[PDB]
């Protein structure tokens, strides 16, 4: 029937916020916070005063969502007073920045009614005397987005020319800064702090339990009547809810002890309505919850022990040998010959105590060794992963390390589950389970 | 291999289930054989299967 689809797509459009900016709701533990970025951006695209914030709050903590909530709020009516110019802190290293800045002073200029040309001396010199320098202007609204990178600890330009065209200057700007770090002021430079409005502007966490339910109340409920199934689809919504003791409440409970965030709620609850084909299907979904329990075991199926479940018997008494020694070491290291001088130990004790278990050759052993440091079994001795930067992983891509040019069977591992978390994660009816002591 | 074995040795008791049966057979036989060797990876089997087939 294609009454229930339309119930469907729009509880998915709410759940994903691509709503129309007439019902796009604001949650109200973020209502305080999204009303001080109206009150910021609201003088400078009408009252064209200049100034800068930076937003700090943690991932996922709505910072994009709120001001692309601004930016279409004043631009159903003051679409000509203003453009924006956003640029990210990973994409936009500090010299590709004004390039991004005289790109993004083009394109959006001509969409109104050539500053990109040249090198960078002119291109910066071209948006200095631009920005820098009755009757109304254009203000040019900054979104600078993980501003951090900008603050780095060597000269900061980029913010010391953005911050100096906000009080110096004839054209009124007002620039955002959406980052992450707590400690934003001590990054910055001490006459880059100086021209800082210093207004920064925490976002808000979840205080209660009572706000991540009236969250999910305000994200699941319907507001404009399109299906017919609405008049039921609210009220047996509320049910789940108000009643403190239903499945619902209670993943709502362990959510808000665990990571205390909405969107890991709406990626569990997008699969559940996608999938659901029926209305009362959908209902007795959201009635038993019989999915947020399948998807939240998918969820931990492969870190270390939902492949370690996955594991052959030579493999695992391997992994077991391997674990015991490192275990007897003194730091923690190992390789081949030791643990294969555990493992045929071991195994002619399985075979002393009585059918068997058939020795594989060191020949055999090999594919098995190969096969556990592809699934993060072992690590190096002092091997560090993925490098921060983009350059360290190049710096050391021309270096020839010494633990990969000795042979294959004195490379130095190191155990990544240590013989105690292995104890109590293999059945106590396995043939290896007494060696897991020592 | 298979197909020119079958008139090598002058077989006519055979039909489709005759060598689907023994091909099935044979893969469980390097299963049961050759599980606690590899894991459960089907590459490490898929060739398995293409050396020891003839
Ligand atoms: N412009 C947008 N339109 C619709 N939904 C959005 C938009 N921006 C973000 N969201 C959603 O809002 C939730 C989190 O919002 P975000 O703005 O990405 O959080 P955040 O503060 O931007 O994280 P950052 O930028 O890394 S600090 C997710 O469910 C996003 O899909
Ligand atoms: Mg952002």
Same mark, same amino acid.
């Given at each position: 029937?294609?009454?229930?689809?339309?119930?469907?797509?729009? +509880?998915?459009?709410?759940?994903?916020?691509?709503?129309?900016?007439?019902?796009?709701?604001?949650?109200?533990?973020?209502?305080?916070?999204?009303?001080?970025?109206?009150?910021?951006?609201?003088?400078?695209?009408?009252?064209?005063?200049?100034?800068?914030?930076?937003?700090?709050?943690?991932?996922?903590?709505?910072?994009?969502?709120?001001?692309?909530?601004?930016?279409?709020?004043?631009?159903?009516?003051?679409?000509?007073?203003?453009?924006?110019?956003?640029?990210?802190?990973?994409?936009?290293?500090?010299?590709?920045?004004?390039?991004?800045?005289?790109?993004?002073?083009?394109?959006?200029?001509?969409?109104?009614?050539?500053?990109?040309?040249?090198?960078?001396?002119?291109?910066?010199?071209?948006?200095?005397?631009? +920005?820098?320098?009755?009757?109304?202007?254009?203000?040019?609204?900054?979104?600078?987005?993980?501003?951090?990178?900008?603050?780095?600890?060597?000269?900061?330009?980029?913010?010391?020319?953005?911050?100096?065209?906000?009080?110096?200057?004839?054209?009124?700007?007002?620039?955002?800064?959406?980052?992450?770090?707590?400690?934003?002021?001590?990054?910055?430079?001490?006459?880059?702090?100086?021209?800082?409005?210093?207004?920064?502007?925490?976002?808000?966490?979840?205080?209660?339990?009572?706000?991540?339910?009236?969250?999910?109340?305000?994200?699941?409920?319907?507001?404009?009547?399109?299906?017919?199934?609405?008049?039921?689809?609210?009220?047996?919504?509320?049910?789940?809810?108000?009643?403190?003791?239903?499945?619902?409440?209670?993943?709502?409970?362990?959510?808000?002890?665990?990571?205390?965030?909405?969107?890991?709620?709406?990626?569990?609850?997008?699969?559940?309505?996608?999938?659901?084909?029926?209305?009362?299907?959908?209902?007795?979904?959201?009635?038993?919850?019989?999915?947020?329990?399948?998807?939240?075991?998918?969820?931990l199926?492969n870190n270390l022990t939902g492949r370690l479940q996955s594991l052959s018997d030579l493999e695992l008494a391997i992994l077991i040998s391997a674990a015991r020694v490192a275990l007897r070491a003194k730091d923690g290291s190992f390789n081949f010959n030791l643990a294969y001088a555990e493992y045929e130990k071991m195994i002619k004790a399985i075979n002393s105590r009585?059918?068997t278990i058939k020795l594989w050759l060191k020949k055999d052993v090999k594919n098995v060794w190969e096969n556990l440091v592809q699934l993060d079994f072992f690590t190096e001795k002092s091997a560090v992963g993925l490098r921060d930067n983009?350059?360290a992983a190049?710096y050391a891509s021309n270096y020839q390390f010494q633990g990969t040019m000795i042979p294959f069977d004195l490379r130095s591992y190191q155990m990544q589950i240590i013989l105690q978390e292995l104890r109590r994660i293999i059945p106590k009816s396995n043939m290896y389970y007494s060696w897991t002591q020592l | 291999?298979?197909?020119?074995?079958?008139?090598?040795?002058?077989?006519?008791?055979?039909?489709?289930?005759?060598?689907?049966?023994?091909?099935?057979?044979?893969?469980?036989?390097?299963?049961?054989?050759?599980?606690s060797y590899?894991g459960?990876?089907?590459?490490?089997?898929?060739?398995?299967?293409?050396?020891?087939?003839?």
């Amino acid at each position: 029937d294609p009454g229930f689809g339309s119930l469907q797509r729009r +509880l998915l459009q709410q759940l994903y916020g691509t709503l129309p900016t007439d019902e796009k709701i604001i949650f109200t533990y973020l209502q305080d916070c999204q009303q001080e970025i109206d009150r910021i951006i609201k003088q400078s695209i009408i009252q064209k005063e200049s100034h800068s914030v930076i937003l700090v709050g943690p991932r996922q903590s709505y910072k994009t969502y709120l001001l692309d909530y601004e930016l279409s709020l004043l631009q159903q009516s003051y679409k000509e007073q203003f453009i924006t110019i956003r640029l990210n802190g990973f994409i936009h290293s500090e010299q590709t920045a004004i390039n991004g800045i005289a790109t993004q002073l083009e394109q959006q200029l001509q969409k109104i009614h050539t500053i990109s040309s040249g090198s960078l001396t002119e291109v910066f010199e071209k948006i200095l005397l631009l +920005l820098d320098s009755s009757i109304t202007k254009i203000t040019v609204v900054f979104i600078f987005d993980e501003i951090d990178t900008f603050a780095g600890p060597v000269r900061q330009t980029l913010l010391y020319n953005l911050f100096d065209m906000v009080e110096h200057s004839r054209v009124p700007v007002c620039i955002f800064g959406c980052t992450t770090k707590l400690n934003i002021l001590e990054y910055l430079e001490k006459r880059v702090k100086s021209r800082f409005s210093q207004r920064v502007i925490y976002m808000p966490q979840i205080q209660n339990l009572d706000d991540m339910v009236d969250a999910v109340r305000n994200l699941l409920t319907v507001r404009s009547e399109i299906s017919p199934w609405v008049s039921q689809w609210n009220e047996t919504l509320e049910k789940e809810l108000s009643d403190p003791r239903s499945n619902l409440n209670r993943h709502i409970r362990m959510n808000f002890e665990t990571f205390r965030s909405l969107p890991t709620l709406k990626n569990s609850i997008i699969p559940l309505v996608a999938t659901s084909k029926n209305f009362g299907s959908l209902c007795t979904a959201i009635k038993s919850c019989s999915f947020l329990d399948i998807y939240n075991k998918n969820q931990l199926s492969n870190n270390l022990t939902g492949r370690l479940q996955s594991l052959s018997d030579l493999e695992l008494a391997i992994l077991i040998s391997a674990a015991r020694v490192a275990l007897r070491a003194k730091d923690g290291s190992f390789n081949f010959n030791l643990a294969y001088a555990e493992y045929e130990k071991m195994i002619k004790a399985i075979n002393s105590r009585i059918n068997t278990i058939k020795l594989w050759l060191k020949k055999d052993v090999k594919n098995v060794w190969e096969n556990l440091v592809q699934l993060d079994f072992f690590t190096e001795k002092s091997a560090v992963g993925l490098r921060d930067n983009a350059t360290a992983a190049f710096y050391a891509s021309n270096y020839q390390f010494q633990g990969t040019m000795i042979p294959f069977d004195l490379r130095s591992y190191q155990m990544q589950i240590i013989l105690q978390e292995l104890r109590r994660i293999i059945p106590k009816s396995n043939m290896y389970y007494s060696w897991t002591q020592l | 291999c298979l197909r020119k074995r079958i008139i090598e040795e002058q077989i006519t008791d055979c039909t489709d289930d005759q060598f689907q049966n023994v091909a099935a057979n044979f893969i469980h036989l390097i299963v049961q054989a050759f599980h606690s060797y590899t894991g459960n990876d089907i590459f490490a089997l898929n060739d398995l299967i293409d050396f020891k087939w003839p």
